[PDB]
């Protein structure tokens, strides 16, 4: 019929994709953490920091086939694209039976006694069977497990002092019927079943805070283009918009900017540190039709 | 203002920014998070229209 009808919505598509990251030529030593000369225990695990480097995770793929490679809060294939503010690495060696217990929100003896992950865990868990690498017939004493703990552990809590757990209220020392010896450190021979076979295991704990510190993956920086609709990726902040010169007096501390509503409205270039305003053209579309019984022309 | 500000809410999702969800996760879990967000935003729009 004759009239004006709103039908669809128009938008102006981007013509280029821009990615900007700081010039960091270092490489993160994940494969050195995983390939430890001597391995820490689940009882006492090696927390090591990884920072100010390029988080290249293909080195892991080339470095081994893996018994397990599971990422809970992040996709296993997309690590090389993201930017991780505070990537921690927790390395140890563990029995196979308990490898399934390294997962958030799960219940199990090793979760209660030795090492637990939070319910709100963002990260990855990686495991490679260690029989063909370190395990001697005499047995390695890298393994160490808390047979019994007085109280359950919090996420990422460590407790090292060995003290005997008492059956009752009276103190016990060395008398088996009333003494629960806190540890079962034991070197295991390659011939044991799979449930006891060792596994070198590394847990990567990623905290995502839009990268104040970067340690960003191996993305390739491209030239900054302004006054055009583009798909921008500034230091992990992805979006689509027009980047223009900013007249806002940021402090040197601040990076991201925001409007009265929480929409990002300004950013800092990771390389040149220039403040750029992000302007979103989009709108409705109305078709003005005289009516098809009169004419097929339309505005 | 309230309608625009409801976008910053998570409604239980890991993040309120859809681009973060699509950049971090594979489809079969990004769908769960995006469905949580869709439910929240649909509720906001229905309230605004009413």
């Amino acid at each position: 019929e004759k009239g004006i009808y709103q039908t669809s919505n128009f938008r102006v598509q981007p013509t280029e994709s821009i990615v900007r990251f700081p010039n960091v030529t270092n490489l993160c030593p994940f494969h050195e953490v995983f390939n430890a000369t001597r391995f820490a225990s689940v009882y006492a695990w090696n927390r090591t920091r990884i920072s100010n480097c390029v988080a290249d995770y293909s080195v892991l793929y080339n470095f081994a086939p893996f018994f397990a490679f599971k990422c809970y809060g992040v996709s296993p294939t997309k690590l090389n694209d993201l930017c991780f503010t505070n990537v921690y690495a927790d390395s140890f060696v563990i029995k196979g039976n308990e490898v399934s217990q390294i997962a958030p929100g799960q219940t199990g003896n090793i979760a209660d006694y030795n090492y637990k992950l939070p319910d709100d865990f963002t990260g990855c868990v990686i495991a490679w069977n260690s029989n063909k690498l370190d395990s001697k017939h005499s047995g390695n004493y890298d393994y160490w497990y808390r047979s019994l703990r007085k109280s359950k552990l919090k996420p990422f809590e460590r407790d090292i002092s060995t003290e005997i757990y008492q059956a009752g209220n009276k103190p016990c020392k060395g008398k088996g019927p009333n003494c629960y010896f806190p540890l079962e450190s034991y070197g295991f021979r390659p011939t044991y079943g799979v449930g006891h076979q060792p596994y070198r295991v590394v847990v990567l704990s990623f905290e995502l805070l839009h990268a104040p510190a970067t340690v960003c993956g191996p993305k390739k920086s491209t030239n900054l283009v302004k006054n055009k609709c583009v798909n921008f990726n500034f230091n992990g902040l992805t979006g689509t918009g027009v980047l223009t010169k900013s007249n806002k007096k940021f402090l040197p501390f601040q990076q991201f900017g925001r409007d009265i509503v929480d929409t990002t409205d300004a950013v800092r270039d990771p390389q040149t540190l220039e403040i750029l305003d992000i302007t979103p053209s989009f709108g409705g579309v109305s078709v003005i039709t005289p009516g098809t019984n009169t004419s097929n022309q339309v505005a | 203002n309230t309608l625009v500000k409801q976008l910053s809410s998570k409604f239980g999702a890991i993040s309120s920014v859809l681009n973060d969800i699509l950049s971090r996760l594979d489809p079969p879990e990004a769908e769960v998070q995006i469905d949580r967000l869709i439910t929240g935003r649909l509720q906001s729009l229905q309230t605004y229209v009413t």
Binding site: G283 | N1, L3
Partner: peptide, 29 residues
């Protein structure tokens, strides 16, 4: 006299109450 042909009272009324969609735009027009 004025560019808008409005009475003085209309000018007072219009002054008292207060194409880029700078504010609130997340599909809202």
């Amino acid at each position: 006299s004025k560019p808008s042909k409005r009475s003085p009272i209309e000018d007072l009324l219009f002054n008292k109450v207060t194409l880029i969609c700078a504010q609130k735009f997340n599909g809202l027009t």
